[PDB]
Each structure stands twice: as structure tokens, then as C-alpha cells.
Amino acid sequence: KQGPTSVAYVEVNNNSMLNVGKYTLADGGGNAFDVAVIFAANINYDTGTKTAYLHFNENVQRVLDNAVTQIRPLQQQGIKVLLSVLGNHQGAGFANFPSQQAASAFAKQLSDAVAKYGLDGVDFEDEYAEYGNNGTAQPNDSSFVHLVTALRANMPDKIISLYNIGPAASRLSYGGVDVSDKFDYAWNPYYGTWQVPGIALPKAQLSPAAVEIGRTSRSTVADLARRTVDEGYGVYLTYNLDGGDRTADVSAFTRELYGSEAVRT
């Protein structure tokens, strides 16, 4: 298979990660999706101790406890699986840590989860944090840089991706360290649109197109897939793959990205 790397986010609350592996290219090809992303763990806040922590709802936790049956089959196929983290309405966000050590400790919880669950990386989604709640600070300049630096130092061989959105996304430099280069990918968060992430990453590691399997039009899927290749970008993001027969939606993008149809099951 040759072309942009395609990513599929799966809302494990109502959907199976295992559906990402059922799509392959009709030609010799290979997987229709290269990266699967578990949506989503959260950054919560312990108000009494003034410290943020990595929270996993029972559903995400179960995908994890059951990684041998929910994740390994994808990984055996060659599919890289990422854990995504989101704000959770608790004041604490990625651009919110008060010190390097606080940001580092959260970095550690992420790092450990990647190792404990044999994952391939972490994806950051700075949305819904609600900076200010529970006496937290507003976004500061150092927090996200501290987090990324610490996370990358812990797992130098894993993927760290940025969901282009929120305060953190534009706070990539503090001190003599710009953490842009510490990211493997950055993608557009808005479905059915083309929005080039501003992060100083090469076009091969960026995905300006964002489509939602099931809610974004088929002509739009092809158009953004074709534009991805033509413009020189190397990543293509698909949001919310379900368990329905999405063979034709997947083919609309595999055709442009790799010159082939998709086949399911």
C-alpha cells in the first residue's frame, strides 16, 4: 500500500475498536486504516489536592483491561493504536499545569498507561477542560510544553499526536524548547472540512482533512481525500467508525489516497 496514513477514531463507549481492522484494500493493498485511536480517556481534577489525573471511564477502562481481545487483533494487522485524552469539565487542562513537575506527573500517568496496555501512543484533545473551574488557572504558556517534553522523554519511541484545537495547540514553545517536533501528527478536528493545522510539522505528518464516517457526505469524502494527496499532505483522519457496513464511505477515500476500493469483514 502506498499513500497518506489514514486514521480512524472510535468512540468505544458505543463502538468496537475491532471494526477498524475489517477494512482492507480490494487490491493487494492492506489495511484501509493505519492508525486506530481509542476515544477517550480524560484529564480530571482532584480539587482537594489541587492535582489533575488521567481518568478512564469504565468503558474505556474495559477496552484496556481487555486489550488482548480488543486491541491486539488490530495491532497484529499492523494497525497502530493510540489512547486519546480529552478535557472533562474540571478546570484542569493540558495548558493548565502550575509547574513542570505537575505536568510531568501527568505525563507519567500517560506514559505508564501506554506501557501497561501495550499501546502505540497518546493523542491530545484540548476541548472541554473548562479552565477556571475548581480554582484552576487560565491557560499559561509553560504547561503544555512541560507536558509534551516530559511525555516524549518517557516514551521516545511512541506516537504523540495533536488534535488541533484548544489553548494548548497554540502554546508549543516556552523556554528554549519548541515541542512541535516532539509530535508525530497533527490533525484538523472539524468534520467535512479542510483546515491545515498551524503547527510547524511537515506536510507528511499533517491531516488538514477531517471526515466523519456516517455524517460526512460521500462526495465530500472523496474531495478531501483527493485534496490531501494533491496538496502534498500525508495523513487522513476519519472520525467515529461504527459497526455498520461502511464499505462505500471507506472506498470513497481509499480510491483517492491509494488508488483502490475497500472490502469489509
Coordinates of C-alpha atoms in Angstrom, one line a residue:
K1 CA 0.0 0.0 0.0
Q2 CA 1.2 3.5 -0.9
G3 CA -0.2 6.9 0.1
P4 CA -1.2 9.1 3.1
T5 CA -1.6 7.4 6.6
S6 CA -5.3 7.2 7.4
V7 CA -6.6 7.4 11.0
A8 CA -9.8 6.2 12.5
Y9 CA -11.1 7.4 15.9
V10 CA -13.5 5.0 17.6
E11 CA -16.0 6.1 20.4
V12 CA -15.5 2.9 22.4
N13 CA -18.5 3.9 24.6
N14 CA -20.8 2.7 21.9
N15 CA -18.4 1.2 19.3
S16 CA -15.9 -1.6 18.9
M17 CA -12.3 -0.9 18.1
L18 CA -12.3 -4.1 16.3
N19 CA -14.2 -2.6 13.3
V20 CA -11.0 -0.6 12.2
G21 CA -9.4 -3.9 11.1
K22 CA -12.2 -5.2 9.0
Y23 CA -11.4 -2.7 6.2
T24 CA -8.6 -3.6 3.7
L25 CA -7.8 -2.6 0.2
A26 CA -9.5 -4.7 -2.6
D27 CA -6.2 -4.8 -4.4
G28 CA -3.1 -6.4 -2.8
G29 CA -3.3 -3.2 -0.7
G30 CA -3.6 -3.8 3.0
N31 CA -5.5 -2.1 5.8
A32 CA -7.8 0.8 4.9
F33 CA -6.9 2.4 8.3
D34 CA -3.3 2.7 9.6
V35 CA -3.9 4.1 13.0
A36 CA -6.9 3.4 15.3
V37 CA -7.5 5.9 18.2
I38 CA -9.3 5.0 21.4
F39 CA -11.7 7.8 22.3
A40 CA -11.2 8.7 25.1
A41 CA -9.5 9.0 28.5
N42 CA -9.9 12.3 30.4
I43 CA -7.9 14.7 32.4
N44 CA -9.8 15.2 35.6
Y45 CA -9.0 17.2 38.7
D46 CA -8.8 16.4 42.4
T47 CA -10.0 19.7 43.8
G48 CA -8.9 18.9 47.4
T49 CA -5.3 18.1 46.4
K50 CA -5.1 20.6 43.6
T51 CA -3.9 18.0 41.2
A52 CA -5.0 16.7 37.8
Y53 CA -5.1 13.0 37.0
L54 CA -5.7 10.7 34.0
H55 CA -9.3 9.3 34.3
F56 CA -10.7 6.3 32.4
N57 CA -14.4 5.8 32.4
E58 CA -15.4 2.2 32.9
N59 CA -16.0 1.7 29.2
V60 CA -12.5 2.9 28.1
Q61 CA -11.1 1.0 31.1
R62 CA -12.7 -2.2 29.9
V63 CA -11.3 -1.8 26.4
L64 CA -7.9 -1.5 28.2
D65 CA -8.4 -4.4 30.7
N66 CA -9.5 -6.4 27.6
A67 CA -6.6 -5.3 25.3
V68 CA -5.7 -8.8 24.3
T69 CA -9.2 -9.2 22.6
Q70 CA -10.0 -5.5 21.8
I71 CA -6.6 -4.1 20.7
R72 CA -4.1 -6.8 19.8
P73 CA -6.1 -8.0 16.8
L74 CA -5.7 -4.6 15.2
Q75 CA -2.1 -4.4 16.2
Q76 CA -1.5 -7.9 14.7
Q77 CA -2.8 -6.5 11.4
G78 CA -0.2 -3.7 11.6
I79 CA -2.6 -1.1 12.9
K80 CA -1.1 1.3 15.4
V81 CA -3.5 2.1 18.4
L82 CA -3.4 5.4 20.2
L83 CA -5.1 6.5 23.5
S84 CA -6.9 9.9 23.2
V85 CA -7.3 12.2 26.2
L86 CA -10.0 15.0 26.5
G87 CA -10.9 17.7 28.9
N88 CA -13.7 16.7 31.3
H89 CA -15.2 19.9 32.6
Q90 CA -12.9 20.1 35.6
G91 CA -10.7 23.2 35.2
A92 CA -7.6 21.0 34.7
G93 CA -6.5 21.0 31.1
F94 CA -3.3 20.4 29.1
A95 CA -2.4 24.1 29.1
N96 CA -3.1 24.4 32.8
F97 CA -0.4 22.8 34.8
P98 CA 1.1 25.1 37.5
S99 CA 4.6 23.6 37.3
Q100 CA 6.9 21.4 35.3
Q101 CA 6.7 18.7 38.0
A102 CA 2.8 18.7 37.9
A103 CA 2.8 18.5 34.2
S104 CA 5.5 15.8 34.4
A105 CA 3.5 13.7 36.8
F106 CA 0.5 13.7 34.4
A107 CA 3.0 12.8 31.6
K108 CA 3.9 9.8 33.7
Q109 CA 0.4 8.6 34.0
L110 CA 0.0 8.7 30.2
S111 CA 3.4 7.0 29.7
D112 CA 2.6 4.2 32.1
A113 CA -0.8 3.6 30.6
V114 CA 0.8 3.3 27.1
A115 CA 3.3 0.7 28.5
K116 CA 0.8 -1.2 30.8
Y117 CA -1.7 -1.5 27.9
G118 CA 0.9 -2.0 25.1
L119 CA -0.4 1.0 23.2
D120 CA 1.3 2.9 20.4
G121 CA 0.9 6.4 21.6
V122 CA -1.2 9.3 23.0
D123 CA -3.4 11.8 21.3
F124 CA -4.2 15.2 22.9
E125 CA -7.6 16.8 22.6
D126 CA -7.8 20.2 24.4
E127 CA -11.5 20.6 24.5
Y128 CA -14.0 20.7 27.4
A129 CA -11.4 21.3 30.1
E130 CA -13.2 24.4 31.3
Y131 CA -10.1 26.3 32.5
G132 CA -11.0 28.3 35.6
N133 CA -13.2 25.6 37.3
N134 CA -12.3 24.4 40.8
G135 CA -9.9 27.3 41.3
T136 CA -7.7 26.4 38.3
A137 CA -5.6 28.8 36.3
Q138 CA -6.4 30.1 32.8
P139 CA -4.1 28.7 30.1
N140 CA -0.5 29.5 30.8
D141 CA 2.5 29.5 28.4
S142 CA 4.6 26.7 30.0
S143 CA 2.1 23.8 30.9
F144 CA 1.7 22.1 27.5
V145 CA 5.4 22.4 26.7
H146 CA 6.3 20.8 30.0
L147 CA 3.8 18.0 29.4
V148 CA 4.9 17.2 25.9
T149 CA 8.6 17.3 26.8
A150 CA 8.0 15.1 29.8
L151 CA 5.8 12.6 27.9
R152 CA 8.3 12.4 25.0
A153 CA 11.2 11.8 27.3
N154 CA 9.3 8.9 28.9
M155 CA 8.3 7.2 25.7
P156 CA 10.7 8.3 22.9
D157 CA 9.5 5.5 20.5
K158 CA 5.7 6.0 20.7
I159 CA 3.4 8.3 18.8
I160 CA 2.3 11.7 20.2
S161 CA -0.4 13.3 18.2
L162 CA -2.2 16.6 18.4
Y163 CA -5.8 17.1 17.8
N164 CA -5.6 20.7 16.5
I165 CA -7.8 22.6 19.0
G166 CA -7.8 24.5 22.2
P167 CA -5.4 26.6 24.2
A168 CA -2.6 24.0 24.2
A169 CA -2.4 23.8 20.4
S170 CA -1.0 27.3 20.2
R171 CA 1.3 27.1 23.2
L172 CA 4.0 25.0 21.7
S173 CA 7.0 27.0 22.9
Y174 CA 8.3 28.1 26.3
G175 CA 11.9 28.3 27.3
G176 CA 14.3 27.3 24.6
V177 CA 12.1 24.3 23.8
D178 CA 9.5 24.2 21.0
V179 CA 7.7 20.9 21.3
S180 CA 6.3 20.9 17.7
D181 CA 8.9 18.5 16.6
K182 CA 8.0 16.2 19.5
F183 CA 4.7 15.5 17.8
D184 CA 4.3 12.8 15.2
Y185 CA 1.0 14.0 13.8
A186 CA -1.4 16.9 14.0
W187 CA -4.9 16.8 12.5
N188 CA -7.9 19.0 11.8
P189 CA -10.8 18.5 14.3
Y190 CA -13.6 19.7 12.1
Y191 CA -15.5 17.1 10.1
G192 CA -16.1 17.6 6.4
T193 CA -13.7 20.4 6.3
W194 CA -10.1 21.3 5.2
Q195 CA -8.2 23.2 7.9
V196 CA -4.4 22.9 7.8
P197 CA -3.0 22.6 11.4
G198 CA -0.7 25.6 12.1
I199 CA 1.9 23.5 13.9
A200 CA 5.3 23.5 12.3
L201 CA 5.2 19.9 11.3
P202 CA 6.0 18.7 7.7
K203 CA 3.0 18.2 5.4
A204 CA 3.6 14.4 5.6
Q205 CA 2.7 14.5 9.3
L206 CA -0.4 16.7 9.0
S207 CA -4.0 16.0 8.1
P208 CA -6.0 19.1 7.0
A209 CA -9.0 17.0 6.1
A210 CA -11.3 15.6 8.7
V211 CA -14.3 13.5 7.8
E212 CA -16.9 11.7 10.0
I213 CA -17.8 8.2 8.9
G214 CA -21.6 8.3 8.6
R215 CA -22.2 12.0 8.9
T216 CA -20.0 13.5 6.2
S217 CA -21.1 13.3 2.6
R218 CA -19.6 10.9 0.2
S219 CA -18.6 13.5 -2.5
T220 CA -17.0 15.5 0.3
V221 CA -15.0 12.4 1.5
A222 CA -13.6 11.9 -2.0
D223 CA -12.9 15.6 -2.5
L224 CA -10.9 15.9 0.8
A225 CA -9.1 12.6 0.1
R226 CA -8.1 13.8 -3.4
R227 CA -7.1 17.2 -2.0
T228 CA -5.0 15.5 0.7
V229 CA -2.8 13.8 -1.9
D230 CA -2.8 16.7 -4.5
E231 CA -1.7 19.3 -1.9
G232 CA 1.0 17.1 -0.5
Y233 CA -0.3 16.1 2.9
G234 CA 0.4 12.6 4.3
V235 CA -2.4 11.9 6.9
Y236 CA -6.2 11.5 6.5
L237 CA -8.5 11.5 9.5
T238 CA -11.8 9.6 9.9
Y239 CA -14.0 10.1 12.9
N240 CA -16.3 7.7 14.6
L241 CA -16.2 4.4 12.6
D242 CA -19.1 2.3 13.7
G243 CA -20.1 -1.4 13.1
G244 CA -22.3 -0.7 10.1
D245 CA -21.4 -1.7 6.6
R246 CA -19.3 1.5 5.8
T247 CA -17.6 -0.1 2.8
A248 CA -18.6 2.6 0.3
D249 CA -17.6 5.5 2.6
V250 CA -14.2 3.9 3.1
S251 CA -13.9 3.3 -0.7
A252 CA -14.5 7.0 -1.4
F253 CA -11.2 7.8 0.4
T254 CA -9.1 4.6 -0.3
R255 CA -9.7 5.3 -4.1
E256 CA -8.1 8.7 -3.9
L257 CA -5.4 8.0 -1.2
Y258 CA -4.2 4.7 -2.5
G259 CA -5.9 4.0 -5.8
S260 CA -8.2 1.2 -4.7
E261 CA -11.6 0.2 -3.3
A262 CA -12.1 -1.2 0.1
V263 CA -13.6 -4.6 1.1
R264 CA -15.1 -5.3 4.5
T265 CA -15.3 -8.3 7.1

